[PDB]
């Protein structure tokens, strides 16, 4: 009776597509055609943080917009003071293969993970000096890809085992698990209100999960290739995506369909990092073409190019106040960009 | 103000300490050569890992990271074992490895196409187009027994055997039949043709027929790695 279940599956999918189309009336490019473009915005490398021994794979700012943590495949977690371009902490890592790093909102914890399949949590404010491994979150039967602290005690980590999870640091076991992605889950972003999070996988689709329940509410789709970078629009009602199909996409939570594709004929390499600005108007995405293109959110127009990286960019984020955007690439260099007046 | 100046001085002192430690770790990182061991389930990768775990004091959810010294040179050979069948995204973490030691069963005569496609993917990957591959055609003795005993014919699986002959630059082992030379070099030339019919001048393949004694295996790895680093230093110095 597997054929009957398949028939029901296609019937439900057709019904969902019909509902989305019935809710699809006007394209966002149509309504925002009248929106005044931000124009050509230029930004420069105010501070180029250097010291990373090997390629940079991930970066995460702090809530105070001052401290950022960058992970390198050398096996280091360097915490930088962007305002004064000094290194505050350097955490040697057990496994050199690091694919993620997270800064806790409270500022007292850092996270890391990679091919070792274990999420490593580090205390920054121990009673004594130096940084030590707090807990080792084990149970992911695959490489960790992205992790983000919900709160000082909880953390939701995404893995290549086609299943995300939310952990308890003290407990150390997966309190809730999130299953449903067919391929490797790579990215993970938290809503401004810590109630929901979305994760995009190698199944060329992105799913939205509810933290306190454990089932994915919606499954946004549309990307031709695997979704390798995700981020949340600041409003909390939208989220943008990055795929190796060279087309960033914006999906809104409510209408539950594609809104625009940020595409260009010249661009053929894949996006690697996506992060909206504070007003949500500027979507900054990095590519394998060794530079970042800032995309207007309301109009599919390239605002500017953040050239300056020799190798492919891997991470990109903005401060909580949006004062600056820092992009790390595989040339072991992390560079902060800030608008020029 | 005075307190802010003291905080700035303390932060600078922390910077100096971290920078000294980072220079030391840069020294140890430049010294160390990172090798990646790849292969299929039927390939002798597991045997090599088990051997090297105890021979070189292997440190050991599935990353077999071992660091050893051979002739005062630092090596870091690792195998991704805990990951699932998908290999298109955790392989990007290995774009900077010194070499990719590829282990092929070479006696399955059935799964050789999977190994060929794996070598194609490794060679033509955009992020591994710089990395040389040390081709390790393992289980050469088993292939010799299979060819000598007859029974299965390689012509059934690979059809180009009927129009292939030993190259003039052939190095058979002293006492050993022509047919097994033909089969062995057919496999080697299949891999080499797959390698050469691609971008050259950046990465090269190092075919090797694994023998019973593993010291020759380690010697071939060492020589290939030295060659790779020599060529890379030629590239950075511009003399290429």
């Amino acid at each position, epitope marked *: 009776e597997l054929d009957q279940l398949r028939q029901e599956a296609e019937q439900l999918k057709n019904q969902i597509r019909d509902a989305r189309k019935a809710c699809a009336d006007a394209t966002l490019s149509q309504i925002t055609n009248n929106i005044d473009p931000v124009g050509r915005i230029q930004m420069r490398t105010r501070r180029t943080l250097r010291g990373h021994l090997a390629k940079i794979y991930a970066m995460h700012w702090g809530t105070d917009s001052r401290l950022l943590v960058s992970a390198s495949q050398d096996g280091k977690l360097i915490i930088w003071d962007s305002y004064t371009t000094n290194k505050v902490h350097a955490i040697p890592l057990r496994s050199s293969w690091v694919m993620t790093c997270a800064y806790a909102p409270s500022g007292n914890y850092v996270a890391c993970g990679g091919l070792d399949n274990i999420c490593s949590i580090y205390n920054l404010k121990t009673r004594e000096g130096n940084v030590r491994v707090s807990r080792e979150l084990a149970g992911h039967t695959g490489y960790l890809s992205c992790c983000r602290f919900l709160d000082d005690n909880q953390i939701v980590t995404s893995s290549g085992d086609t299943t995300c999870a939310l952990w308890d640091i003290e407990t150390g076991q997966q309190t809730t698990t999130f299953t449903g992605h067919t391929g490797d889950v790579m990215s993970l972003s938290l809503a401004p209100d810590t109630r929901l999070f979305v994760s995009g996988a*190698c199944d060329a689709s992105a799913k939205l999960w509810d933290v306190r329940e454990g089932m994915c509410r919606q499954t946004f789709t549309g990307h*031709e290739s*695997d979704i390798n970078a995700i981020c949340f629009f600041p409003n909390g009602n939208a989220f943008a995506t990055g795929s190796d199909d060279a087309t960033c996409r914006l999906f809104d939570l409510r209408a539950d369909q594609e809104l625009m594709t940020y595409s260009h004929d010249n661009i053929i390499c894949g996006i690697t990092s996506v992060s909206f600005s504070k007003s949500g108007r500027l979507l900054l995405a990095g590519y394998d073409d060794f530079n970042c293109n800032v995309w207007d959110a309301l109009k599919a127009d390239r605002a500017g190019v953040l050239a300056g990286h020799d190798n492919r960019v891997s991470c990109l984020g903005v401060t909580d106040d949006g004062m600056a955007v820092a992009t790390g690439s595989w040339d072991s260099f992390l560079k902060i960009w800030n608008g020029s007046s | 103000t005075e307190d802010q100046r003291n905080e700035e001085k303390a932060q600078r002192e922390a910077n100096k300490k971290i920078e000294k430690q980072l220079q030391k770790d840069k020294q140890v990182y430049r010294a160390t050569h990172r090798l990646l061991l790849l292969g299929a389930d039927n390939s002798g990768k597991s045997t090599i890992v088990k051997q090297m775990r105890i021979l070189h004091g292997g440190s050991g959810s599935g990353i077999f990271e071992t660091k050893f010294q051979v002739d005062k040179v630092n090596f870091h050979m690792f195998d991704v074992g805990g990951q699932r069948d*998908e290999r298109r995204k955790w392989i990007q973490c290995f774009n900077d490895v010194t070499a990719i030691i590829f282990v092929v069963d070479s006696s399955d005569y059935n799964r050789l*196409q999977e190994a060929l496609n794996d070598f194609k993917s490794i060679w033509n990957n955009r992020w591994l187009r710089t990395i040389s591959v040390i081709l390790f055609l393992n289980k050469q003795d088993l292939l010799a027994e299979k060819v000598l005993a007859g029974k299965s014919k390689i012509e059934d*699986y690979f059809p180009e055997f009927a129009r292939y002959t030993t190259p003039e630059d052939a190095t058979p082992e002293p006492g050993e039949d022509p047919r097994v030379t033909r089969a062995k070099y057919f496999i080697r030339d299949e891999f080499l043709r797959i390698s050469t019919a691609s971008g050259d001048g950046r990465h090269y393949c190092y075919p090797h027929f694994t023998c019973a004694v593993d010291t020759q295996n380690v010697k071939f790895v060492f020589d290939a790695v030295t060659d790779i680093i020599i060529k890379e230093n030629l590239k950075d110095c511009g003399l290429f």
Partner: nanobody, 129 residues
Framework: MQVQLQESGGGLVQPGGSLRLSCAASGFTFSNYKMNWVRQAPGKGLEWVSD????????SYTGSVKGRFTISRDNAKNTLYLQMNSLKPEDTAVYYC?????????????????????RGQGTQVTVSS
């Protein structure tokens, strides 16, 4: 839309016969992808059979099918054709048409893996006598 690849043409045929395979595709620009053909003999894994480039310039076949099957790529209809000729019982399997993971690139890495999104349910080509 959701990436889909629906195979067709699977059916019973006596040894030495012929068969046609069609892979209707949607949701992605068919032109810039190295489409492949993979198959599963009973009690075996996924074996790569044939592949084709963006425009058909470079085609390759598994040695077992070197002189038996042809691959055609009609970019207009977004359909991949695997012509099945001179069938023998060793070819019985469910045939899945699979797309290379990334556009404008020739590194088809995860095509024969146990789970792979850019593929199809497939059709069973039975060569029973």
């Amino acid at each position: 839309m959701q990436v889909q690849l629906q195979e067709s043409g699977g059916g019973l045929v006596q040894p030495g016969g012929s068969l046609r395979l069609s892979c209707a595709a949607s949701g992605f620009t068919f032109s810039n992808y190295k489409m492949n053909w993979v198959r599963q003999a009973p009690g075996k894994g996924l074996e790569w059979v044939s592949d084709i480039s963006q425009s058909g310039a470079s085609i390759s076949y598994t040695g077992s099918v070197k002189g038996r099957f042809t691959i055609s790529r009609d970019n207009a209809k977004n359909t991949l054709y695997l012509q099945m000729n001179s069938l023998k019982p060793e070819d019985t399997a469910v045939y899945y048409c699979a797309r290379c993971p990334a556009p404008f690139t020739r590194d088809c890495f995860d095509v024969t893996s146990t789970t792979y999104a850019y593929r199809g349910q497939g059709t069973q080509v039975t060569v029973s006598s």
